[PDB]
Amino acid sequence: PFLDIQKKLGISLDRHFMFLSAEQPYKNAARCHAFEKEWIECAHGIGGTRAKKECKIEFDDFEECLLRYKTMRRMHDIKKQREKLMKEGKYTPPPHHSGREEPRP
Amino acid sequence: PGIVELPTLEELKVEEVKVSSAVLKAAAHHYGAQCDKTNKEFMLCRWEEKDPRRCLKEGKLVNGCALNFFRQIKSHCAEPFTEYWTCLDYSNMQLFRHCRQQQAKFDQCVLDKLGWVRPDLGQLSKVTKVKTDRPLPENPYHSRARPEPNPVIEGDLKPAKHGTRFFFWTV
Amino acid sequence: MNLYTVIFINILLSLTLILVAFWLPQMNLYSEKANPYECGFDPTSSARLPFSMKFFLVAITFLLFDLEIALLLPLPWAIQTIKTSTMMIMAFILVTILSLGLAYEWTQKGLEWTE
Amino acid sequence: RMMRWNQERRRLLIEDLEARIALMPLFQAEKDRRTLQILRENLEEEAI
Amino acid sequence: MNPITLAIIYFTIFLGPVITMSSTNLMLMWVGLEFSLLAIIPMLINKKNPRSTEAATKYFVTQATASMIILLAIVLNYKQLGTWMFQQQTNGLILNMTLMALSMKLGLAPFHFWLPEVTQGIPLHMGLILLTWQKIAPLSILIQIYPLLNSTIILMLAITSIFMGAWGGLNQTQMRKIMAYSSIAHMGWMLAILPYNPSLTLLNLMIYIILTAPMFMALMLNNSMTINSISLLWNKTPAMLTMISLMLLSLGGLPPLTGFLPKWIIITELMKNNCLIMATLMAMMALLNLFFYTRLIYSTSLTMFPTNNNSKMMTHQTKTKPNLMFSTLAIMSTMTLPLAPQLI
Amino acid sequence: ISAFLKNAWAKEPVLVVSFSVWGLAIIMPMISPYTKYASMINKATPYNYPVPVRDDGNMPDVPSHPQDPLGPSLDWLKNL
Amino acid sequence: MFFINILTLLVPILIAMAFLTLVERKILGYMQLRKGPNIVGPYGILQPFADAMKLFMKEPMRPLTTSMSLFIIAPTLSLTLALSLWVPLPMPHPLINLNLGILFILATSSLSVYSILWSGWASNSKYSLFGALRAVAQTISYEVTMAIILLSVLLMNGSYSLQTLITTQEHMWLLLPAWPMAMMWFISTLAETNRAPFDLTEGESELVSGFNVEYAAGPFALFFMAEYTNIILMNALTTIIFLGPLYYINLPELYSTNFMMEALLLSSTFLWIRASYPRFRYDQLMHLLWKNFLPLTLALCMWHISLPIFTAGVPPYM
Amino acid sequence: VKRFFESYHEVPDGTQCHRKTYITTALGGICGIIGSAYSVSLNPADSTLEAVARVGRYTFTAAAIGAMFGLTTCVSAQVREKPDDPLNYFIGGCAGGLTLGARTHSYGTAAMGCVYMGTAAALFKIGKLEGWELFPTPKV
Amino acid sequence: MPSTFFNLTMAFSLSLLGTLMFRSHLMSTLLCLEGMVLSLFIMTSVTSLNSNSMSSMPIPITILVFAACEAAVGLALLVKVSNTYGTDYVQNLNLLQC
Amino acid sequence: MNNYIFVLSSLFLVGCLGLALKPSPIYGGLGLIVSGFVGCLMVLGFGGSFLGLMVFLIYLGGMLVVFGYTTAMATEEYPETWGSNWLILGFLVLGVIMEVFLICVLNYYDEVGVINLDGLGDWLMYEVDDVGVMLEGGIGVAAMYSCATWMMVVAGWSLFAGIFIIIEITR
Lengths: 105, 171, 115, 48, 344, 80, 318, 140, 98, 171
Description:
The structure is cut from a larger assembly and holds 10 protein chains of 10 kinds. In chain I, about 75% of the residues lie in helices and about 0% in strands. Chain I is an all-alpha fold. Chain J is mostly helical. Chain J has helices at about 5-20, 25-45, 50-70, 85-110, 140, 150-170. The radius of gyration of chain J is 21 Å and the shape is flat. Chain C: It holds the Pfam family Oxidored_q4.
């Protein structure tokens, strides 16, 4: 920060709930805990300009966990192809996806 | 880029308990004492190794010990236990307090036969120190190597060479 | 969907009831019955004019006290925490601060109305 | 009286939660293999 | 105002920015900005006249929107990255919206239309705080995120602030608006360099404060608010013309006074990055910033205006108002250039 | 001041009760011995799974089983 | 079968409203040394139906100065909220089991105000607007105390669920722990619902039937039955909270019966109070309910925060 | 699209005169629309019709400025074949100033705008030629 | 979720467009500010519930607190404006230019 | 019921749009109330009860004061409904139509990534904890009393000092 009075005195008024992997009230993990932890543990000691390209894989995995865009694309593609095939009459959905399965437990 | 590995259907085909929730809440306190070793091994694997795909067999042992447990309850103390869980399932939050007299029948049966004592108030709410032939997981989270920090300039610092190199100030 | 259903049922009861109230009876409309009451005589001006409110400061501090309620209301969950001293002190401080503000307003005659 | 009664309620809760703790492993195992079954089914359909 | 209220309000004014500095969460940052907002309005509206009501309403309504825009930027960052800090690999639209709202908070052009109005609508104090202390936390936001800002609108806004402050102060007979347009121009000089060694932004800030505070005191000593009122100073308190002159000529940056150091070193660090013609334009409109200061100091110090018959009563009586800090701040301005390497 | 409070108990007894109850709420937690069992009871409640621990071979005080002697005996909560 | 449940919850509440009107008139009569209705039925058990039918045969008033949209929509909202408030009520097993029932009640009532407050504006007239502003003042007065009272009371229950109060009161009532909070809750339920002495919105002698002076027919009837439904609701809330009846898991109809008894007692108490006292002033109400009730309310909230701790009586989260 | 305005430099001056011409005309039109939005928001008209007239006058004026600029530049570069010569841009800026002082009835505006715009366009070419990166990224 | 976040951001933009583009009254501007507050609240709350970040859930209550204080002082300024001019209009506030 | 959340979001957009068109503060407050209701409903749809209930309560208590004020200050003879102005009615219709056309446009230039009409309702909740307790909204807010006690003090100071600010502005 501008005036690191917290680091001066060792207190944490606000710098302990800065992100997701940070002390949820009872120990319930937020989603992308692992991804954010890994990104942050890569980007430590480094600052900025070097972390933005030496810790890019981990940030990209985090971004896909949180915003989760490529899985939307993947399922949308699978669904679109399925609808095309069912319209053409090529695909035949099974019982365990039409609503008739043997429940496991 | 990398394909996900997954087990087959037959790597999950298992003899299931097929047993409801009040029948199970009734025998919870005895299933926490008996069949604790397998359950705690499964827990340690499931939390030490963050993958379900690395612990299916411990889950299968869990299911097996539970089935053996209820087989003991069936071949011995089936009627009092039936009455207990039947009266327990009536409630909406499945409260032990409303069925406190059938506990007595079930516990006296399961004590006079097999010597199974009910755990007291806070014995199932603590850590329990399991062992196993397994090893530690080396590098969970599949973490890559950490990049090396930038080196620190080692030196006993000196006066600035000719002071401030500003424009024309001498000192 | 149970709750949505109950509310739709009550909604449709009210609307069917108003429909009946309007389209069942007889009507004899004319301008002398559809004009505002004002006790036999006619109004001297419109009712869509300023009505000076003389408790506006009380209204605003009611808003702030509403926020204080919103801050106090998590206490039933705050009590099942392990600390039970920080929450005590902090709730004490919040309530005492609100009481201090109420006392300042009271003494400064903010709870009195603007005659 | 309220003190003593809530005291007992905080013990009945301990009992219920302990039962939850005892049965967490079975539910966890079954949850795991059910999720894996569903994913393998999705995969075997996506293939065709 | 009773003392309890003054304690509360001035504590809040002091704690707004202090929370803004000593906070890593952007949301407590926003909280500090809102304390600065809330606590200023009572003392803006203290004298209870239409001018004060208008000033307070304009201030409030302009700052609330900027606050909401900053909160939007913060919430969009939280959605994007799950954190409460503007990292790298954030969206330039988020960062630019933050910059726009912060410029509306400061008073930069083309968001400058409210500052001279508000400043004229309030006393000399509450112009000092508004122009000096309220500028410090909004600047702290930018200083904390300087390697993330786009170096294009940061400079277009600076250039607009320079030009418009110069042109607006060219024709203002009211002094409370001259100070406002000076604020606009100096915030322009700051914001231009803020992506380039932001230590110099704080340098210009400190220099600007040290120049404006004693100038406001000078206006306070006789409640001067007009060229014609400051011109009747060779009779009332004529021992102040020396310092007023040197302070105005430091504000409009002339070399031997320390108010040229920020412009000089800014031009240096801007020519070190091939930002040449922008610096040329800025340096050439700072001259017009100097012109009206020169007109003013003609009017008050070099070409003594007519006075009145009733101004002799002021000579009969005595004064106590110079707080002993006017001297220190006026002399540490106007005479501290040879110590510039220790300032940088 | 005793006379002042005597007057205030007649005129404006609502604020007297209020200040009395405020001070009582602040002072009585300092007095009781039962005040400390609250955090202990809130701690005893196992909302989350007690995750087992690997046997290093150097965990004597840690139990090997639920109903072993070791660990925090919750009998202080019984017969409190 | 859920719709049959809706019936068994809604139609008897409407008959209860209708016969509460009769009970009000007759009790006020006998307190006033007269016999109320005893003509239209044997003992006047048809006057409510007569009133309803006659009101729905009268021609409604659509004035010229009015805003017809808000005008027609406000009684709709009034009855809808009065009738949705009965939804989570555990008597003992509710129709809709919510985890934040008391917040549902609070928000629903704070929205029920807007019926009065928009009908008064839409009905463009003077006494109408007077009633609206008096409603604003009334709500400003009572809402804070209602919330903090209810907080302090449930601070020994452990949740906002209404069903947990039954187990909180398995061996006792919450009236002996909190009779002061119960007093203030009662009088805030009396300020809510616009019921005498805190009427101040249809104050026939101050205003000429505020917020209903321009309403004639079934709309006015809807406002009427909304009021007389909220009365029974608030009595039901007081007797679920403080006067906790006996659950007895095998005998739940016992809970329902004792609930009936206590709710009738407290409603008859409302009518009694109408008959006994004169009306407050809507500034005197503020002075009362800020300068007497809110200090003691905050003090007792502090007390009820301390009390779970220094007695080791922190309740459970389910 | 930035590529549209970057098409001004796909080929040197003297070539593709119409292209560069109405590119510069579009640029002037954009700047005039900005100035018009500002003059209509601040100091607004007595009527929406006069506001529209203000917009039209400002926009067509700046469009004519840009058009004369591009015409003059590419012509004086085709004639006296010399692309790398800022005097062409000077003559274009002077033609723009002349059109400014023609559309707006003023000889003094014409001369003032001629000098200022001519020097500005000369400096523009000199910077495009020598590599003056205004709004540069921080390097130190 | 992306749909509703888009819609909520467009709602914020509409309320911002509103409070910028003035009409005669000022109360409407204050209401537009309240609407911006509300949209920001819902965005924060939905992000927190999605991510299961119960550590950030104290943020929207703070938003409501400070926004309501903002509304309070705005309404007090409105009281003063009416006491001066009588009719709430923002066109009567045109004497600081001179 | 898959388009539930999209309908709620669209209704909220329309409420805030009719707000931004600025009729008298009566109908503006009506819009605030309806939009806060819708906000509560979607905050519940995403798994949050407390936050929605509190938006509803706060905005109701606020619009009460807005009514009390606008009857005194922001009142005219003809309060200018949405229908009062043909131009406002036109911009409202045009805004609905424009947002509909915009949604149908961005559902084309990007198959998915900003809006998914095709898969709608499939991406709402994002990894719920299927087994859980002590997990609702309210624990996180109650952390204002423990582990986030600076939010509590700073908010309380805002309210406290706001009282003094109110008194001084009004005096």
